[PDB]
Amino acid sequence: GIVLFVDFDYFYAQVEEVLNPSLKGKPVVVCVFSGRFEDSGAVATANYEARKFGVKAGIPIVEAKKILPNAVYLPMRKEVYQQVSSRIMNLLREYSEKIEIASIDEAYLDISDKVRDYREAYNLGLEIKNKILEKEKITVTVGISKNKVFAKIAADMAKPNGIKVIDDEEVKRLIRELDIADVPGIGNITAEKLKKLGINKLVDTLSIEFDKLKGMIGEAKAKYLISLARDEYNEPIRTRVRKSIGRIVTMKRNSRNLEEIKPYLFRAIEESYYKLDKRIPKAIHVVAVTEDLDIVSRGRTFPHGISKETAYSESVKLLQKILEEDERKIRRIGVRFSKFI
DNA sequence: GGTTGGATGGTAGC
DNA sequence: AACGCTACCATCCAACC
Ligand SMILES: [Ca+2]
Ligand SMILES: [Ca+2]
């Protein structure tokens, strides 16, 4: 089988530039502002001219303004990027019925009944690149391989505005020689734990006993890496079913005052319910993030489904419970629905 | 032995 | 260290079939 993975480059930053072409060539840093102070928050994503100097998703905004004070710092407009993403995903469906929306900027297309060999895949890849450039003025990277994972690695090597096939013999080679930290799903925490066990390449996961690997990185990532290592991985391309939905917001000031927090929790429940869109949850968890960024969850599963109005009533009960059983001040508050019918 | 449930701890990645 | 946010996984213990 053949798989084609499209990744939209520095996506949030690219859309900001489509909407204001005077950003071409400038360092653009899309940010999530908390409302605490001037410029308090975290970088959601930055374009290649900002990443050049260390300004990446995750780091605090104040770190970034120390590195690039004259960079354009924009607030995040998820609703806008979502719309753009959805219009690009629609173009992608013209090339394949079998598609998987992995995220707001990532999709996999199974193209096994659309092309015979990797030559054609490349050509269709340029046809997807040109098409998205044509309609939305967005560059993307295309990666083609025999499975979802090596198609995503192909895009990673060819990043910005690239395209790259990985044929069967280079899969064999990469199981042997690819830094294992560049395997999708393997962050820096997991890369350091693996490096402590002496696993630097995918093939090294077959020397260590399975239980010693599972005991370190969980059964899920264990089976995943051993599978890629055998060259046996072959998960189908499918609609990702979301298991939970919710919002948590940052409060203006830290607090332990039910009536001061109520409005935020209620605001988060509203937004969560619109995101649910016809899905009926049976479970609610209130998540309070404390003064020191630790987390305090209280929850309930119901015999029956949860209405918006029941969620308000039940979230106050659960929040009251956090205030009784834990006396730290709360900084962020919100809600997490799950167990959909 | 497996599952549902809730609390605590933790992770990848835009 | 600073610091936002969605959603996912992992471990323990309790209660249960
Ligand atoms: Ca991406
Ligand atoms: Ca318990």
Numbering used by the authors: 1 to 341
Would you copy out the relevant sentences from the publication that reported this structure?
Y-family polymerases are able to bypass a variety of DNA lesions that impede high-fidelity replicative DNA polymerases. 7,8-dihydro-8-oxoguanine (oxoG) is the major known product of oxidation of DNA by reactive oxygen species induced by either ionizing radiation, photochemical mechanisms, or normal cellular metabolic activity. Our kinetic primer extension studies demonstrate that the bypass polymerase Dpo4 preferentially inserts C opposite oxoG, and also preferentially extends from the oxoG•C base pair, thus achieving error-free bypass of this lesion. The Dpo4 polymerase embraces the 19-mer template/13-mer primer DNA by its four domains: palm (residues 1–10 and 78–166), finger (residues 11–77), thumb (residues 167–233), and little-finger (residues 244–341).
In the case of the postinsertion binary complex, a covalently incorporated cytosine is positioned opposite the oxoG site and forms a Watson-Crick oxoG•C pair. Residues 3–19 of the template strand can be traced in the electron density map. The finger domain is positioned directly over the Watson-Crick oxoG•C pair with one Ca2+ cation coordinated by the D7, D105, and E106 at the active site of Dpo4. Upon covalent cytosine incorporation, there is retention of little-finger contacts with the phosphate groups of C7, T8, A9, and C10 on the template strand, and the phosphate groups of G6, A7, and T8 on the primer strand. By contrast, the contact of the thumb domain with the phosphate group of T13 is relocated to the phosphate group of A12 on the template strand. At the same time, related thumb-domain contacts on the primer strand are displaced from the phosphate groups of T11 and A12 to the phosphate groups of A12 and G13. Upon covalent base incorporation, the restoration of the B-DNA conformation between the nascent base pair and its adjacent base pair propagates toward the 5′ end of the primer strand. The conformational transition accompanying a restoration of the B-DNA step results in the contacts between the α-helical segments of the thumb domain and DNA phosphate backbone shifting by one step.
